Structure formats: structure tokens, C-alpha cells
Amino acid sequence: VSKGEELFTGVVPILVELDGDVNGHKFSVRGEGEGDATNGKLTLKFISTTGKLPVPWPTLVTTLVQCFSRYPDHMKRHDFFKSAMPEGYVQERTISFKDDGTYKTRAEVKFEGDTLVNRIELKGIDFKEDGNILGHKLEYNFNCHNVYITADKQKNGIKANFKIRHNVEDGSVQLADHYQQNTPIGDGPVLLPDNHYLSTCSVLSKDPNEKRDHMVLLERVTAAGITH
């Protein structure tokens, strides 16, 4: 249904680069792996190049490629993300951590050669030094969530909204409200979807041989909410 979708009929290499600043703590993350939109699966490893991160890895998961979502056949006309490829899209978010600070992110997601690249800048402000983020009080795990997508005709793109639930080590939960906008980089028509969601689950792990602060991630993501 889009030319871009043909770039995803196979396993695609991924590169991710993030430069961040949270409360004046600068950090850089670099990642690589592969995505398979036929299965709605991704596998990535991320490392810090700047030493121990100032924030928990789980708080960076959503920022660190929704073009790898599996769209069921009956929903393929609603896949904005692949329709924007290869030229790609700008993905912007605000992430508001309840009772704590906020991240603002801006990313370009596009092909370079055969690789899907996600390059991000992140700025975090107003975090509490004694809170769950700067205090590293979040469990090293991740819940399943629904990402609610709506068309944004005036920007020829989409918006999304969702609430991430981060488990806290004391048994509480830290909510992170996500507000997202995506705009195509290229000038040709894109697929503007009816309202739907991405059902996403993620598993976080470690590489026993990796000495840098790091995160290994496996994600499963499939679109839903529009019946055959």
C-alpha cells in the first residue's frame, strides 16, 4: 500500500545515536541491532560512551523506531511510519514524569543505505535529585503499553499519546506521560491513519561481556484497533 513498506520485507539493520542532557548531566548513547516488521520484533544493544548514565535506562526506552511495528494486512493502509520511508520522519516528544521532571526529544528516523537510523537529541529539566529518575530507583524492566495514534492532517503526519508505567524498586509505580508528534521528511503523500494503537511489550537484559553501562532490549510491537 506504500512504496516505503517494501523496505521492511526483511530484517533491517538499525543504528541509534542519542545525545542527552538531564539537569545539566550530559550523556551519549549509541546502539545497534535489527528490526523485523514482518514479525513486529526488534533486538538492540545500547551502550553509554560517557560513563554511568545519570538516568535509568528504562526512562530512555521509548526515545531510543515505530516503523518496525507489525501492521496486520487489514490495517496496512494506516501505517504512516513506513509510508514516510526512505526519507523518514521527525519524531518529537515531551515526556512528563509524574511528580518529577520532563524530557523533550527530537529525532530524525530515516534510511541511510540499508540501515534504519534513529538520531536523537534529548533535554531533561526540573528533575528532583532525590526522585526516582536521578536517584536511580527504577527497576530494570519494562511493561507492555498501548500507543494511541491519531492523524494530524495539518502537519501531514500523526500524533500519539500514551502513559508509560515504570516499576519503582519500593513497589510503587512512576508514570511517564508521553506526548508525541511525527512529521514526514519527504514531500510525497503519506498514509494518514484512522485512530488505532500499537500494542508494545519490551524485555530488558544485560550483556555479560559488556563493561560499559548498557542495555540489551527485545521489543514486540503490533498495530491494532481497526477490525478486518
Domains of the chain, residue spans: 4-224
Q: How far apart are CA 36 and CA 34, in angstroms?
A: 7
Maximal C-alpha separation, the chain: 50
- Signed CA dihedral, 133, 222, 69, 183: sign only: negative
Which of 29, 13, 25 is CA-nearest to residue 119? 29
**Measured in Å, how far apart are the chain's first and last C-alpha atoms?**
16
Helix (H, G, I), strand (E, B) or coil at 190: coil
User: Hey, what amino acid is at 124?
Assistant: G
The burial class, CB within 10 Å (0-12 / 13-18 / 19+), for 172 is exposed
Residue with cell 528533575: 127
Which of 92, 100, 90, 107 is CA-nearest to residue 22? 100
CA distances from 176 to 133, 163, 219 (A): 11, 6, 19
- Nominal resolution (angstroms): 1.0
DSSP for 68-137 reads GPBPPGGGGGG-HHHHTTTT-EEEEEEEEETTS-EEEEEEEEEEETTEEEEEEEEEEES--TTSTTTTT-
4 backbone dihedrals φ, ψ, rounded to 5°: -60, -30
Method: X-ray
* Domain 4-224 CATH class label: mainly beta
Residue with cell 548514565: 53
Q: Which three cell numbers stand for residue 139?
A: 527497576
Q: Which three cell numbers stand for residue 13?
A: 539493520
Which of 20, 5, 82 is CA-nearest to residue 213? 20
